[PDB]
Amino acid sequence: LAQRLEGLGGIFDIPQKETRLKELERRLEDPSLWNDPEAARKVSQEAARLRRTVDTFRSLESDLQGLLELMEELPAEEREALKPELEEAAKKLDELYHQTLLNFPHAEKNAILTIQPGAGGTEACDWAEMLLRMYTRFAERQGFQVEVVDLTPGPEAGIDYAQILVKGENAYGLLSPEAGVHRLVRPSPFDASGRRHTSFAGVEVIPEVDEEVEVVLKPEELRIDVMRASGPGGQGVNTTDSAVRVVHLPTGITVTCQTTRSQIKNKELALKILKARLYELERKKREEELKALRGEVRPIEWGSQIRSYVLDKNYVKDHRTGLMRHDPENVLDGDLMDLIWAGLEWKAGRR
C-alpha cells in the first residue's frame, strides 16, 4: 500500500505542476497580483519533493537488497554510511505518508475544539467531561498547550459545555477527524439499578486561522457583556471580576471567555475565537454553494455516532474507519493517534 501511496499521493499530475510554479514566478510582471506570487514558491516545495520521493524510493529500495551485504557480513564501513541514510528514510516514509494525510487546508493551525452533552441526562454531562479529559490528556501527551476558553458545569454533574484552544503544530489537522457525535455505553453511576445507559455528546473542531484572512469587526456589530458566573449570596467582590461574553448581532454567534484574570486579554481571545467561527460559517456556506452547481440531493453525511465507547464490554469502536480497540481505558486517557491516522485516511479517501 505504501506502494499505492504514490497512488493517491499523485505522482503523474504533480510532476507537471512543479515546472509551473516556476514559470509564473519567472515573468517580471508576477508581483502585480501579490497574493499569488507568495504561494508559488511555497507550492514549489512539491516541485522539489517528488524527486525527493523517487530519490527516496531508490534509496529505500537499496534496502530491497541493501542489508544483503550486512546479512552476509556484519561489520560495514561503507554499508553503515548508507544505513544512517535509511533511518532518514524509514522515518522519511512514515513522515511522507503522515505528511500527505495532513495537507488539506489549515491542518497546520491550532485548534478550537468544543464539547456539549447530547441525550442521556446527567450521564451525558459526565461523558462530556470525560471526552474533555480525553482531549486534554491527548494534548498533554503531544506537547500542545491547552487554553480553557470556557467551561460551563452541569446542573447535577459533569459539564454542560466546554471549549478549548489547543496550541501546537497541526493541532487542527490531527484533531479534525474527531469532530462528530460520540456514544457512551455503560451502567450509570447515577442510577442505582445496574441498567446500561446510553449517552451522547458531540465534538466540534474548526481551525484558529491567521486573523489577516479573517474579517474585521465593527464595535457596533457586537455587544460586549462582563459576566460574573453566580456567587451564592456573596456578591460584594463578585460584582465585577473578569469574564466577557461577546455577541455578534448579525448572526447571534456568541463567545464567552473566562481564561485569565485580565478581563482585557479575555476580550481578545473571545474575539479571536469568534472571528474564526464566522470564518467557518463562511466556508460552510461557500460549500453549500458548489452544490447549487450540480448538487441537487444530499452530499456525504454521517448522522449517528462516528465512534462508540462501550465500557462494560471493553472496547472502543470507530464506525467510520472500522478500527476497534480493546483498551478503552487508554483511549480515554489520551492515546488517540491510531484512531486519528485512520480517520485522516478515511477523510482523505473521500475528496
UniProtKB/Swiss-Prot annotation:
GO cellular component, one term: cytoplasm
UniProt-listed SUPFAM superfamilies: Release factor
Residues where N5-methylglutamine is found: 235
A Pfam family the protein falls into: PCRF
Record-level Gene Ontology MF annotations: rRNA binding; translation release factor activity, codon specific; tRNA binding
UniProt family annotation: Belongs to the prokaryotic/mitochondrial release factor family.
Protein name as catalogued: Peptide chain release factor RF2
Primary localization class, coarse: cytoplasm
SMART domains: PCRF (SM00937)
Function: Peptide chain release factor 2 directs the termination of translation in response to the peptide chain termination codons UGA and UAA. In endogenous ribosomes interacts with P-site tRNA and 23S rRNA. In the presence of truncated mRNA in the 70S ribosome, ArfA and RF2 interact such that the GGQ peptide hydrolysis motif of RF2 rises into the peptidyl-transferase center and releases the ribosome. Recruited to stalled E.coli 70S ribosomes by E.coli ArfA, but cannot be functionally accomodated in the peptidyl-transferase center. Note T.thermophilus probably does not encode arfA.
InterPro entries: PCRF, Pep_chain_release_fac_I, Pep_chain_release_fac_I_sf, PrfB
Subcellular location: Cytoplasm
Keywords, sorted A to Z: Cytoplasm, Methylation, Protein biosynthesis, RNA-binding, rRNA-binding, tRNA-binding
Provenance organism: Thermus thermophilus (strain ATCC 27634 / DSM 579 / HB8)
Quaternary data: Interacts with the ribosome. Interacts with ribosomal protein L11. Recruited to stalled E.coli ribosomes by E.coli ArfA.
